[PDB]
Design a protein around this ligand. Structure first.
Ligand SMILES: Nc1ncnc2c1ncn2[C@@H]1O[C@@H]2COP(=O)(O)O[C@H]2[C@H]1O
Length: 166
Protein backbone atom coordinates (compact mmCIF):
# COMPACT_ATOMS: atom_id res chain seq x y z
CA UNK A 1 0.00 0.00 0.00
CA UNK A 2 2.84 2.41 -0.93
CA UNK A 3 0.61 4.93 -2.66
CA UNK A 4 2.41 8.01 -3.98
CA UNK A 5 1.23 11.17 -5.66
CA UNK A 6 -2.39 11.00 -4.57
CA UNK A 7 -4.52 14.05 -3.85
CA UNK A 8 -6.58 13.68 -0.65
CA UNK A 9 -10.17 14.64 -1.49
CA UNK A 10 -11.75 13.67 1.84
CA UNK A 11 -10.58 12.02 5.04
CA UNK A 12 -10.69 8.63 3.30
CA UNK A 13 -10.81 9.19 -0.48
CA UNK A 14 -7.63 9.83 -2.48
CA UNK A 15 -7.29 10.35 -6.23
CA UNK A 16 -4.48 10.10 -8.78
CA UNK A 17 -4.13 10.45 -12.53
CA UNK A 18 -2.74 6.98 -13.18
CA UNK A 19 -3.25 3.60 -14.83
CA UNK A 20 -4.66 1.24 -12.20
CA UNK A 21 -2.57 -1.62 -13.66
CA UNK A 22 0.67 0.33 -13.21
CA UNK A 23 -0.42 1.44 -9.73
CA UNK A 24 -1.13 -2.16 -8.77
CA UNK A 25 2.29 -3.31 -9.99
CA UNK A 26 4.12 -0.54 -8.12
CA UNK A 27 1.99 -0.44 -4.96
CA UNK A 28 1.32 -4.18 -4.46
CA UNK A 29 -1.91 -3.26 -2.60
CA UNK A 30 -3.75 -5.62 -0.32
CA UNK A 31 -6.88 -5.12 -2.49
CA UNK A 32 -7.36 -3.96 -6.06
CA UNK A 33 -10.92 -3.40 -7.22
CA UNK A 34 -12.07 -4.65 -10.61
CA UNK A 35 -15.01 -2.94 -12.33
CA UNK A 36 -16.64 -6.24 -13.31
CA UNK A 37 -19.75 -7.54 -14.97
CA UNK A 38 -21.94 -10.23 -13.45
CA UNK A 39 -20.32 -13.17 -15.29
CA UNK A 40 -16.80 -11.90 -14.60
CA UNK A 41 -15.89 -11.76 -18.30
CA UNK A 42 -12.90 -9.42 -18.38
CA UNK A 43 -12.72 -8.51 -22.05
CA UNK A 44 -12.08 -4.77 -22.01
CA UNK A 45 -11.94 -1.58 -20.03
CA UNK A 46 -10.45 -1.85 -16.54
CA UNK A 47 -11.34 -5.54 -16.27
CA UNK A 48 -9.60 -6.43 -19.53
CA UNK A 49 -6.55 -4.40 -18.49
CA UNK A 50 -6.31 -6.07 -15.07
CA UNK A 51 -6.85 -9.50 -16.59
CA UNK A 52 -4.25 -8.93 -19.31
CA UNK A 53 -1.72 -7.96 -16.64
CA UNK A 54 -2.32 -11.37 -15.04
CA UNK A 55 -1.96 -13.04 -18.48
CA UNK A 56 -5.51 -14.39 -18.26
CA UNK A 57 -5.02 -15.99 -14.82
CA UNK A 58 -7.78 -13.76 -13.45
CA UNK A 59 -10.13 -14.95 -16.20
CA UNK A 60 -9.49 -18.66 -15.57
CA UNK A 61 -10.03 -18.15 -11.83
CA UNK A 62 -13.15 -16.09 -12.48
CA UNK A 63 -14.60 -18.76 -14.77
CA UNK A 64 -14.15 -21.36 -12.04
CA UNK A 65 -15.73 -19.03 -9.49
CA UNK A 66 -18.78 -18.54 -11.71
CA UNK A 67 -19.11 -22.26 -12.46
CA UNK A 68 -19.31 -22.96 -8.72
CA UNK A 69 -21.21 -19.94 -7.39
CA UNK A 70 -23.13 -18.50 -10.35
CA UNK A 71 -23.17 -14.90 -11.55
CA UNK A 72 -22.88 -11.95 -9.21
CA UNK A 73 -25.81 -9.63 -8.56
CA UNK A 74 -25.66 -6.07 -9.78
CA UNK A 75 -24.31 -4.12 -6.82
CA UNK A 76 -22.58 -7.25 -5.55
CA UNK A 77 -19.00 -8.43 -5.32
CA UNK A 78 -16.70 -11.35 -4.77
CA UNK A 79 -13.12 -11.58 -3.49
CA UNK A 80 -10.68 -13.60 -5.62
CA UNK A 81 -6.92 -13.71 -5.95
CA UNK A 82 -5.06 -10.58 -6.87
CA UNK A 83 -2.41 -12.66 -8.64
CA UNK A 84 0.60 -10.40 -9.34
CA UNK A 85 -1.40 -7.18 -8.91
CA UNK A 86 -2.58 -7.42 -5.30
CA UNK A 87 -3.13 -9.89 -2.52
CA UNK A 88 -6.85 -9.89 -3.41
CA UNK A 89 -9.03 -8.63 -6.24
CA UNK A 90 -12.46 -7.35 -5.22
CA UNK A 91 -14.66 -7.77 -8.31
CA UNK A 92 -17.55 -5.26 -8.01
CA UNK A 93 -20.52 -4.97 -10.39
CA UNK A 94 -21.90 -1.46 -10.77
CA UNK A 95 -25.14 -0.83 -12.62
CA UNK A 96 -25.06 -0.64 -16.39
CA UNK A 97 -27.24 2.42 -16.65
CA UNK A 98 -26.96 2.30 -20.46
CA UNK A 99 -28.96 -0.95 -20.25
CA UNK A 100 -31.50 0.52 -17.83
CA UNK A 101 -30.09 -0.73 -14.52
CA UNK A 102 -30.93 1.54 -11.62
CA UNK A 103 -28.29 4.11 -10.71
CA UNK A 104 -29.23 3.55 -7.06
CA UNK A 105 -27.28 0.29 -7.21
CA UNK A 106 -24.09 2.32 -7.54
CA UNK A 107 -24.36 2.90 -3.79
CA UNK A 108 -24.69 -0.85 -3.23
CA UNK A 109 -21.65 -1.41 -5.42
CA UNK A 110 -19.47 1.02 -3.47
CA UNK A 111 -20.69 -0.44 -0.16
CA UNK A 112 -18.62 -3.54 -0.99
CA UNK A 113 -15.48 -1.41 -0.59
CA UNK A 114 -16.22 -1.09 3.14
CA UNK A 115 -15.30 -4.73 3.76
CA UNK A 116 -11.65 -3.74 3.13
CA UNK A 117 -9.55 -1.28 5.11
CA UNK A 118 -7.50 -0.07 2.10
CA UNK A 119 -8.30 -0.40 -1.59
CA UNK A 120 -6.86 0.63 -4.96
CA UNK A 121 -9.90 1.17 -7.16
CA UNK A 122 -11.34 2.67 -10.34
CA UNK A 123 -14.51 4.70 -10.52
CA UNK A 124 -17.45 2.35 -10.88
CA UNK A 125 -19.90 2.24 -13.79
CA UNK A 126 -17.90 4.96 -15.58
CA UNK A 127 -16.69 2.88 -18.51
CA UNK A 128 -19.00 1.13 -20.93
CA UNK A 129 -21.64 1.08 -18.16
CA UNK A 130 -22.28 4.73 -18.91
CA UNK A 131 -22.67 6.38 -15.51
CA UNK A 132 -21.47 9.96 -15.21
CA UNK A 133 -17.99 9.64 -13.66
CA UNK A 134 -18.32 12.79 -11.53
CA UNK A 135 -21.56 11.41 -10.11
CA UNK A 136 -19.82 8.09 -9.47
CA UNK A 137 -17.10 9.89 -7.50
CA UNK A 138 -19.76 11.60 -5.42
CA UNK A 139 -21.41 8.27 -4.58
CA UNK A 140 -17.97 6.92 -3.69
CA UNK A 141 -17.31 9.83 -1.36
CA UNK A 142 -20.75 9.50 0.26
CA UNK A 143 -20.66 5.70 0.62
CA UNK A 144 -17.10 4.42 1.16
CA UNK A 145 -15.82 4.82 4.70
CA UNK A 146 -12.61 2.82 4.43
CA UNK A 147 -9.50 4.17 2.73
CA UNK A 148 -9.83 4.21 -1.06
CA UNK A 149 -7.17 5.23 -3.58
CA UNK A 150 -8.81 6.00 -6.93
CA UNK A 151 -6.78 5.68 -10.13
CA UNK A 152 -8.19 7.77 -13.00
CA UNK A 153 -6.46 6.98 -16.30
CA UNK A 154 -7.81 9.91 -18.36
CA UNK A 155 -6.20 13.22 -17.38
CA UNK A 156 -9.14 15.12 -18.87
CA UNK A 157 -11.51 13.34 -16.51
CA UNK A 158 -9.09 13.59 -13.58
CA UNK A 159 -8.96 17.38 -14.02
CA UNK A 160 -12.77 17.61 -14.13
CA UNK A 161 -13.07 15.46 -11.00
CA UNK A 162 -10.56 17.54 -9.05
CA UNK A 163 -12.20 20.78 -10.21
CA UNK A 164 -15.68 19.51 -9.34
CA UNK A 165 -14.44 18.40 -5.94
CA UNK A 166 -12.24 21.47 -5.27
N1 LIG B 1 -15.29 -5.74 -23.51
C1 LIG B 1 -15.33 -4.88 -22.50
N2 LIG B 1 -15.28 -3.55 -22.77
C2 LIG B 1 -15.32 -2.68 -21.75
N3 LIG B 1 -15.38 -2.93 -20.44
C3 LIG B 1 -15.42 -4.26 -20.20
C4 LIG B 1 -15.39 -5.26 -21.15
N4 LIG B 1 -15.45 -6.51 -20.54
C5 LIG B 1 -15.50 -6.24 -19.26
N5 LIG B 1 -15.46 -4.90 -18.99
C6 LIG B 1 -15.54 -4.33 -17.63
O1 LIG B 1 -16.91 -4.22 -17.26
C7 LIG B 1 -17.03 -3.06 -16.45
C8 LIG B 1 -18.43 -2.57 -16.27
O2 LIG B 1 -18.31 -1.37 -15.51
P1 LIG B 1 -17.32 -0.19 -15.95
O3 LIG B 1 -17.93 0.37 -17.18
O4 LIG B 1 -17.00 0.72 -14.84
O5 LIG B 1 -15.96 -0.95 -16.35
C9 LIG B 1 -16.15 -2.08 -17.16
C10 LIG B 1 -14.91 -2.93 -17.48
O6 LIG B 1 -14.04 -2.97 -16.39
Amino acid sequence: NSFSGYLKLTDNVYIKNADIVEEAKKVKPTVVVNAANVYLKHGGGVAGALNKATNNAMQVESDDYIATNGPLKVGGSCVLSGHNLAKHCLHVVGPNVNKGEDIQLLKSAYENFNQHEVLLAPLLSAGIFGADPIHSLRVCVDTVRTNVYLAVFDKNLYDKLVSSFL
